[PDB]
Amino acid sequence: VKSQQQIIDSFKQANQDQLFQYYDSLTIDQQQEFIDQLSTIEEPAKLISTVEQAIQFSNFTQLPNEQTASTLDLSKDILQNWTELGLKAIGNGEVAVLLMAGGQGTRLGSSAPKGCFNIELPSQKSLFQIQAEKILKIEQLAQQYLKSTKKPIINWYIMTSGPTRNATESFFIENNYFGLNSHQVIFFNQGTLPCFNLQGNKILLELKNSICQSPDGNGGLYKALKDNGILDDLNSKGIKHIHMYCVDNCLVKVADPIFIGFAIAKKFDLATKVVRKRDANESVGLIVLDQDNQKPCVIEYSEISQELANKKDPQDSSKLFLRAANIVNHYYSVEFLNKMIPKWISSQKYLPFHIAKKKIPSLNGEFYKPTEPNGIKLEQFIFDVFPSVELNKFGCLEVDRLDEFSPLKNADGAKNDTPTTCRNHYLERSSKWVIQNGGVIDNQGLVEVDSKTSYGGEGLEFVNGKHFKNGDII
Ligand SMILES: CC(=O)N[C@H]1[C@@H](OP(=O)(O)OP(=O)(O)OC[C@H]2O[C@@H](n3ccc(=O)[nH]c3=O)[C@H](O)[C@@H]2O)O[C@H](CO)[C@@H](O)[C@@H]1O
Numbered sequence: 001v002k003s004q005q006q007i008i009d010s011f012k013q014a015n016q017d018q019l020f021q022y023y024d025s026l027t028i029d030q031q032q033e034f035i036d037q038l039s040t041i042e043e044p045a046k047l048i049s050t051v052e053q054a055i056q057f058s059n060f061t062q063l064p065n066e067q068t069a070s071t072l073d074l075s076k077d078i079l080q081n082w083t084e085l086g087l088k089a090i091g092n093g094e095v096a097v098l099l100m101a102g103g104q105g106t107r108l109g110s111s112a113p114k115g116c117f118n119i120e121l122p123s124q125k126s127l128f129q130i131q132a133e134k135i136l137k138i139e140q141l142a143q144q145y146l147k148s149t150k151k152p153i154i155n156w157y158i159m160t161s162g163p164t165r166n167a168t169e170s171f172f173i174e175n176n177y178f179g180l181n182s183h184q185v186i187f188f189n190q191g192t193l194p195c196f197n198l199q200g201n202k203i204l205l206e207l208k209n210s211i212c213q214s215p216d217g218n219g220g221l222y223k224a225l226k227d228n229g230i231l232d233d234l235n236s237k238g239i240k241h242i243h244m245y246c247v248d249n250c251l252v253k254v255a256d257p258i259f260i261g262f263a264i265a266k267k268f269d270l271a272t273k274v275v276r277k278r279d280a281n282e283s284v285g286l287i288v289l290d291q292d293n294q295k296p297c298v299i300e301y302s303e304i305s306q307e308l309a310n311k312k313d314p315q316d317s318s319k320l321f322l323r324a325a326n327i328v329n330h331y332y333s334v335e336f337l338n339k340m341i342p343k344w345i346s347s348q349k350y351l352p353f354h355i356a357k358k359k360i361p362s363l364n365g366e367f368y369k370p371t372e373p374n375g376i377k378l379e380q381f382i383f384d385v386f387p388s389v390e391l392n393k394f395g396c397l398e399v400d401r402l403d404e405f406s407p408l409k410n411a412d413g414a415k416n417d418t419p420t421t422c423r424n425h426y427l428e429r430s431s432k433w434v435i436q437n438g439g440v441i442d443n444q445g446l447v448e449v450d451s452k453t454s455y456g457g458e459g460l461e462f463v464n465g466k467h468f469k470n471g472d473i474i
């Protein structure tokens with residue numbers, strides 16, 4: 001739309017003259033490539049103004065009992081009822097899953113997308129394959145429940161970022177989508193945001209003809225859904241329910257019928273899963289009620305005070321007051337998304353920029369890697385839109401952590417959330433399932449239940465009285 005010079009001028013008017021410090025020494029091709037990159041930034045002056053306001057701008061209680069439920073407390077009949085509602089929805093092609101895999105998992109230090117990571121289970125399955133097989137399995141369980149001739153389809157929308165896209169897609173193709181239909185696995189990229197200097201008023205140059213940019217946070221998912229036509233696809237296919245989740249959880253129950261059934265039974269617009277907080281210092285957001293506006297919301301682990309994090313429950317001193325840990329497992333009604341996404345992406349009121357100090361290798365005038373944080377990355381949080389839902393339309397399901405949540409965040413060597421803790425948890429869960437179904441594991445070993453065999457412990461009646469050894473795959 002605008003000329004090359006018009007773009008340059010709009011950045012200079014926004015006081016970003018440093019970006020053109022080496023412009024004249026660049027070849028014409030590098031210049032054109034540079035401005036093309038700058039042109040993707042919609043409204044520079046406004047963005048910078050917003051980042052600045054965000055920087056110079058930086059009463060909770062527990063959610064009402066009416067909006068919460070726990071799989072630890074519900075009777076089998078109630079859980080079965082929800083399961084059936086969930087399976088029926090799946091059986092009618094009304095369910096889609098949305099996988100957030102745009103993160104670069106810096107803490108883990110892997111060169112490949114976290115989803116490809118191998119926590120070294122006997123099966124050597126990557127996180128992506130486990131999730132793929134969970135999807136295939138639940139489709140089959142729904143088909144069996146409804147007695148369908150063919151299995152229903154759960155479209156799997158995978159949100160990648162520029163840096164994880166190629167490897168991610170190439171990985172699924174090389175593995176033939178792990179058994180799923182190629183058409184049901186749909187990739188789409190989330191956007192990016194420019195990185196700024198510590199002061200937060202200047203965009204950082206990565207190279208002489210390139211600015212630093214990073215994935216705009218999982219909160220950038222809503223805009224990516226609209227812009228990539230995913231929302232249109234949901235409507236086109238008649239999908240009514242979508243399960244959004246985090247790629248790092250090796251235990252995740254993708255498209256959990258219990259979770260979907262919970263939302264349908266209660267007619268929720270939005271629902272989220274939580275587990276009991278490990279300890280005051282666990283790096284997890286907490287689901288709470290904002291008493292000032294009487295709206296549900298999440299307080300991120302990095303923006304909570306030690307005092308609030310450590311406060312004990314006044315009605316039970318043995319527990320932390322705020323202990324509903326966010327495990328990034330969200331349910332959204334498609335209708336709710338059709339109605340709200342236009343609003344959410346139209347202002348910071350729902351998706352404010354969160355500031356993160358980072359060590360960003362960039363231009364000094366030469367490229368370099370710092371030892372101290374030299375810039376900031378901007379991020380929108382997926383849950384910041386929660387307050388916009390009506391309290392009575394928001395659900396919070398507490399689940400069993402050992403059965404549903406073991407995140408891979410750190411490289412081996414750390415105390416928690418490592419490939420080892422994930423592997424151990426995965427094997428312990430599998431082993432518990434086998435024992436409960438009468439299976440005998442010799443020499444106190446640990447076995448692995450194949451995701452191709454059981455979704456969550458069901459259909460394991462054949463192991464009763466049967467012997468297994470440490471390392472077996474069932
Ligand atoms: C914002 C957010 O969700 N925070 C949650 C996240 O924290 P945490 O900081 O550990 O995780 P991240 O926000 O980095 O990643 C969450 C998920 O979003 C994806 N992602 C992230 C950034 C991005 O630009 N694009 C993208 O797709 C990641 O691939 C991952 O699947 O998990 C914790 C549990 O482990 C929760 O208690 C936190 O409340």
Ligand SMILES: [Mg+2]
Pocket residue numbers: 064065066067068069
């Ligand atoms: Mg309750």
